[PDB]
Every structure is written in structure tokens, then in C-alpha cells.
Design a protein around this nucleic acid. Structure first.
Lengths: 249, 443
DNA sequence: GAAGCGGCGCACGAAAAACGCGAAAGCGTTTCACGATAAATGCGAAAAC
């Protein structure tokens, strides 16, 4: 796992990603980490199964060797390489089929049930807790501070291992309070939709969205114009009237 | 509720989160020793020994986090003044005047003195001004309210106008700043046509459109956009042209209606005429500098040609390599267009203001201006043979001497009729009688 | 040729979360007493060989 235990270049996403320390995060989630094949003090056995088919290797039958990728399979071409979407779909289906496969010879399955059956059975017999939003957002990768304009928008230049694009994010809370720079937390898979903004000292501010057609967009345009003229008069009258009445000289 | 706790974890500084991270493995490890039933003394001595920490602190914190669930243990480890014065200040800043903050504050101090108000610190005041709203500044100036399928080539065109900063001596001798209307293909960005004139009016738009449909044709699905988010007036032909409805003509063409400054204005040959955005510019030099209409229009045509032919255009279609011309020539060949008939083109020829028709079925147009002076009289039998008083005359300046087409005031074609400096003296005399009287009133 | 307004950085002080020392209470397991009861041993006598 040596190569997996090392973060890639900080610019592998083009824009710079802040360096952090994952061990602490795992320990923080309430997880006890182990670096060997067994858990000391417990009679639970080993992490990796003796039957290769019951492990990650068992997926090569469902993924790498799946008929749709056979042209790009090289074994243990510039024209043959398959699309990322096709590979990942084949991967997801391979995982689904690996889990749903019956006749699994394990104690839990007793040569009859599938991994899905026994998991659905045992998980209902365990006590788990759901993670709050803060916990879930802390596992997201942190991008180096980006500048926020007066309009409350900021930019991230996507590239590297991801498809090139210049993403612009926005929110009203960014223009509505004190901010110059902001740290962006994101999931590479979700960069096209929702990111979470934090202050430079780590305080969550809000989340930001990536910004026949012309007419519906026009409907949303005016719909969003009127609410802006609405919140204008609201914030006015509270700090106005009597004040404006006193100003006359 | 772990919402407030997790928001406290969230709002914590990186240093604070780091502190919690440092303190977590010690509390967790300690828990393991007690589970094994190890004496508290040996456990804490061992932890304080391996980890540099006070045993007492670890013990106390362990008991503190004991009541909290284990996933949240991290989150565990992590102006009274006179309202009258405040209102007075806010009232002052929100005025369109928008005085300087320190000075408006000083004025506030005088008022506070007079009324005995206790004011907060300037820093506090401004801080709170920042805390007010983005919308309030606009409240003061009304500013933000002022801001707030496959497309074929030729399928959607945008019309836009431009006022030139260059002084040009027109065909009638007057020195003016020309206004040009342009039609642009939205997909390729190629300029398809233009017409320049002395002022903004429908004629340049109409005629540039005529140029566009005559040169490239009319597509089967035609969309036209002029973002407005009638022109006319007297008399360049000595007869007035024209109050109309262009709109109908565009809809008739089969068009669905929707509602270079470096190359022209900044070209070296016009340097005497273009003044540039100069706030202070001597008016005494320019009467001599104004450039000829022919030179301006040639520079304009060449500027358009160069704008279109310019490579390195960064658009999707050009991909940072091709020019607007390249991509237009490429996409236009993949679109289905139809050529306009002679009749359609002739229906676009210019409309004259309604003229009176006599009982004999004849009417008159007093030709002049840029055309040779003459008093043309037109006639037809259909004019005396049915109901008509006034009639709109459609014509081609080149064909005024022969055939014109008469329309009713509501737009119905009737028939065609065969043909069987002036007011500027008044304008000038009026100008002198103004200027002399104005100077005489000034003194 | 001149000056002011804005914006930002540095320091003081004070309140609110904190830290180290303890301290007792909550509380579990152990405590000692105290006393009473049996039962285990003491003695002698009477019957037994």
C-alpha cells in the first residue's frame, strides 16, 4: 500500500490543493487504525480472505475481463483504449454483480446466500450512527485559498487528471459579509455542482454552486430580479424612516 | 444536539483542530489501558511518559469527554450608545452625497456634542457600516438595479449599433460623427453586413439587412435579435421618409424577431479626426482635421475585412486557431438557405410618407436633396377608380423617374404608378438669428 | 506642487474558557465486631469385660 500511502502532486488537479494529514482524520471519525493483517486482542481472524475470488481479485472476472472492455484489456492500442464512462460503468456493474453473486462459500453465506444477503442481515443487527454535515465535509479535499469578488463569486481552474474547464462558483453569503479570500472544499467528482467555502481560519461560511433555453433562463432571471428588489426594501425600512426623518438639517 | 458542537468544531482554527488531533490518541490509548483493568496510576504514568502531557490534564479531559459520544470527542476537544446618533450617521451616509466617512463622523461628533450623545469608535462605526449590507450602498445610489439545440451559421443573427468618435466630412459637406449598424452571425462571429449614416435611424438597419440577405440568402429557420432590454424624420430625398412598421417586413422575410474601435476609430489614417477619450481636447484644431467620407468608409470596410480575417480567435468554433471567416465558410456550407426573389428585394425599397391623391388619380413627390431636383407627378387609373385620399409611395431612388408602387395607409398594395440649398437656407438664416441674439443676451 | 481619505497592521486589557491542585462524595468492595450459637473437644463416672 506504499504508493497508496502517498499523496500525488499538489497540482495534479491543476489548481493547488492544501496538504493535510489523514491518519488524524480517521482517528477523529472514531476509527481505530491497524497496519497489519490482524486486530490485536481480538479473535476476528485476518483482514484479507484466503479465497482470492472473495476479494478484490474476484472483480477481474466482472471488470477487466468484461466483454465491453476486451479490446483494451492487455492482461497481467491507441485506438482500442476505452472511454472513462464505459470503464467506470462496467466497474460499477462488476461490483454490483460481485456483491449480488449467490453461491458464495463462506460461513455467513453457508454456500447459499450472497454477500448482499448476509450484509443486509447482519447490518440490521449492528448499532451505527450517521455522520453530521461537518464530519462529511471535513473528508473533502481542501483547495488553496481563492479570491472572492464583490459579487460573491470565485474561480477554480480545473485541469490535470480532470477534464479541463474554468469553473466559477457563487453564493449570496459571500458578497453579504466580510471576505476577501476563501478556502474551497470539494469532491473531484462533485466539482461541477457543489463546493463548500471556509474562511482562512477554517470556519464554514456556506456552500457554492457552479454557475427554449434563453427563455426559461430568462424566467429565472426576472424571478431572481424581483426577490433582489424585495430584499432591498426590507433592509431599507429597518435602518430607514426615523433616521431619514432626523437627517433633514 | 451535536449541531452546535460540530459547528464549534467547524468554526475552530486550524491550530485548534491540530490541538484536538494531538490530544485524541492519548485519550483513546488511555481508554484501552483502563479496559484492561490497569491501575489508573500506571496507565497515566505510562501515557504521560510516552506522550509529553500532564497526567492530571489527561484525566480531567477524559472525564469531560466521557459524557460525549466517541465520534464527537474531537469537537469536544476544540455596543450600547445613542440610537439617535447611530441613525443620524446612517442617514447621512446613505444620501447620494455620500460624504467622506471621517468627516461625516466629525459632523456627527458636533451633533453628538449638541445633543450630548455618546458615540462609539470610528473603527466600530465603519465596521458596522460593513456589517450593514451590500444592498444599502445601492440603496444610496440605486446602482445594482442598473446592472442586475444546434445553431447553424446564418440561423441566428444579432444587430448592434456603434457611434463613432471620429469626425468625418459627409457627402453634404457637414462634419459629423457617423453611426453604423452591423449584423453579426452569432455562431461564427463573422460580420455579414453594414451601413453607415449621419444619425441613428431604421434605414441603416433595413439596408444592412438587405445586404445580408442578398449576399448570403435567407435560411429556412431565421432568428434575428436586437436587444432593447423608429427613426424616420425628413427628407433626404426632399420628401419625408418614413413612419412605418419594419417589423412586418422582417416577419414576412421568414424571420423570427427577438428583443472594431481598434480597426476603425483608432486607425492611423484618421488620427486627425479621432480625438480619443480625451477629457480636455482643443476644439480649435478639428474643423481642418475631419476626414473624408470616402476615406472613413474605406477604412471601415478594410477594418471589417481585417476583423473577420483575423486568426487566433479564441472561440469554440475557431479553437484558438481559425478566423471568423474560416469557421463561417465551413459552417455556412452545412446550412440550408434560399435566395431572395427580385420581388422580395423590391418590397424592401424605401417608403415615402403618405402623399395626397387627387380625383384624377395622380399624386406628387418633390424630389431633391441628394437627387437632382424635379417635381415628379405620378398617375394610375386604379387611384381614381376606387376609394383613396392618401397613399404611401414605395420607391427605388434610381427608379423614381419611371415606376413607383402605391399602398393604402393600412399597408394593402393598390397598384403601381408611372411618372407622367432649398430649406437649408432657412436652417442657416435661423442659425445666425439664433447665435447673434444669444451672444447679445449673454452680454 | 500638495493634502486628505481610506485601509491595514500592531498593542493593550479584559472577560470567558482553562488548567493544576486538591478534596470529598459517590460507591463499591471489604471490615470488623459482637454476639450468639453449635459443636468439638474435655472430664469423669458407671457400666462393661
Amino acid at each position: 500500500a506504499n504508493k497508496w500511502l502517498t499523496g500525488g502532486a499538489p497540482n495534479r488537479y491543476r489548481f493547488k490543493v492544501k496538504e493535510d494529514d489523514p491518519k488524524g482524520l480517521f482517528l477523529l471519525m472514531g476509527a481505530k487504525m491497524h497496519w497489519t493483517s490482524v486486530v490485536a486482542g481480538k479473535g476476528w481472524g485476518q483482514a484479507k480472505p484466503v479465497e482470492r475470488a472473495f476479494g478484490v481479485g474476484g472483480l477481474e472476472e466482472y471488470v477487466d475481463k468484461h466483454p465491453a472492455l476486451a479490446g483494451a484489456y492487455t492482461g497481467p492500442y491507441g485506438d482500442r483504449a476505452v472511454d472513462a464512462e464505459l470503464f467506470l460503468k462496467t466497474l460499477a456493474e462488476g461490483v454490483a454483480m460481485f456483491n449480488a453473486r449467490t453461491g458464495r462459500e463462506t460461513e455467513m453465506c453457508g454456500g447459499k446466500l450472497s454477500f448482499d444477503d448476509v450484509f443486509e442481515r447482519e447490518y440490521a443487527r449492528t448499532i451505527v450512527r450517521k455522520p453530521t454535515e461537518e464530519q462529511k465535509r471535513m473528508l473533502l479535499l481542501p483547495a488553496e485559498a481563492v479570491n472572492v469578488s464583490r459579487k460573491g463569486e470565485f474561480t477554480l481552474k480545473v485541469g490535470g487528471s480532470l477534464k479541463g474547464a474554468k469553473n466559477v462558483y457563487y453564493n449570496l453569503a459571500l458578497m453579504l459579509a466580510g471576505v476577501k479570500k476563501v478556502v474551497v472544499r470539494f469532491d473531484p467528482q462533485q466539482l461541477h455542482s457543489t463546493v463548500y467555502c471556509y474562511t482562512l481560519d477554517g470556519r464554514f461560511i456556506c456552500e457554492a454552486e457552479c454557475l427554449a433555453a434563453a427563455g426559461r433562463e430568462y424566467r429565472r432571471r426576472q424571478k431572481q430580479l424581483k426577490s433582489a428588489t424585495k430584499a432591498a426594501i426590507k433592509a431599507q425600512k429597518q435602518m430607514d424612516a426615523l433616521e431619514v426623518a432626523e437627517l433633514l438639517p | 444536539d451535536r449541531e452546535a458542537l460540530w459547528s464549534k468544531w467547524d468554526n475552530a482554527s486550524d491550530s485548534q483542530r491540530r490541538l484536538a488531533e494531538k490530544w485524541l490518541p492519548a485519550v483513546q490509548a488511555a481508554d484501552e489501558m483502563l479496559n484492561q483493568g490497569i491501575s489508573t496510576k500506571t496507565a497515566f504514568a505510562t501515557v504521560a511518559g510516552h506522550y509529553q502531557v500532564s497526567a492530571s490534564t489527561l484525566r480531567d479531559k477524559y472525564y469531560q469527554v466521557q459524557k460525549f459520544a466517541k465520534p464527537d470527542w474531537a469537537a469536544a476537544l476544540v455596543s450600547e450608545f445613542d440610537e439617535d446618533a447611530w441613525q443620524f450617521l446612517i442617514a447621512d451616509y446613505l444620501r447620494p452625497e455620500k460624504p467622506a466617512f471621517r468627516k461625516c463622523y466629525e459632523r456627527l461628533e458636533l451633533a453628538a456634542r449638541e445633543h450630548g450623545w455618546s458615540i462609539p469608535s470610528r473603527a466600530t462605526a465603519f465596521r458596522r457600516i460593513q456589517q450593514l449590507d451590500e444592498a444599502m450602498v445601492v440603496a444610496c445610489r440605486e446602482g445594482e438595479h442598473a446592472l442586475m439545440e444546434h445553431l447553424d451559421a446564418m440561423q441566428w443573427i444579432n444587430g448592434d449599433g456603434y457611434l463613432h468618435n471620429v469626425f468625418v466630412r459627409w457627402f453634404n459637406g457637414d462634419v459629423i460623427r457617423p453611426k453604423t449598424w452591423f449584423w453579426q452571425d452569432v455562431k461564427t462571429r463573422k460580420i455579414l453586413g453594414w451601413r453607415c449614416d449621419v444619425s441613428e435611424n431604421i434605414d441603416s438597419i433595413r439596408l444592412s439587412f438587405m445586404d445580408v440577405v442578398t449576399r448570403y440568402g435567407i435560411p429556412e429557420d431565421f432568428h434575428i435579435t436586437i436587444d432593447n432590454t423608429t427613426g424616420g424624420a425628413p427628407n433626404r430625398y426632399r420628401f419625408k421618409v418614413k413612419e412605418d412598421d419594419p417589423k412586418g417586413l422582417f416577419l414576412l422575410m421568414g424571420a423570427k424577431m427577438h428583443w472594431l474601435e481598434e480597426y476603425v476609430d483608432k486607425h492611423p489614417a484618421l488620427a486627425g479626426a479621432y480625438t480619443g477619450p480625451n477629457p480636455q481636447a482643443k476644439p480649435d484644431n478639428y474643423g481642418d482635421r475631419a476626414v473624408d467620407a470616402e476615406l472613413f468608409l474605406k477604412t471601415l470596410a478594410e477594418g471589417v475585412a481585417m476583423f473577420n480575417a483575423r486568426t487566433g480567435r479564441e472561440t469554440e468554433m475557431c479553437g484558438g486557431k481559425l478566423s471568423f471567416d474560416d469557421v463561417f465558410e465551413r459552417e455556412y456550407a452545412r446550412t440550408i438557405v434560399r435566395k431572395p426573389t427580385e420581388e422580395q428585394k423590391r418590397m424592401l425599397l424605401l417608403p415615402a410618407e403618405a402623399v395626397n391623391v387627387s380625383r384624377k388619380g395622380e399624386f406628387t413627390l418633390k424630389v431633391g436633396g441628394s437627387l437632382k431636383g424635379a417635381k415628379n407627378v405620378y398617375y394610375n387609373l386604379a387611384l381614381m377608380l376606387a376609394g383613396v385620399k392618401k397613399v404611401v409611395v414605395r420607391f427605388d431612388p434610381q427608379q423614381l423617374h419611371s415606376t413607383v408602387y402605391c399602398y393604402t395607409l393600412d399597408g394593402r398594395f393598390i397598384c403601381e404608378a408611372e411618372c407622367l440649398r432649398e430649406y437649408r437656407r432657412r436652417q442657416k438664416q435661423l442659425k445666425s438669428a439664433t447665435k447673434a441674439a444669444i451672444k447679445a443676451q449673454k452680454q
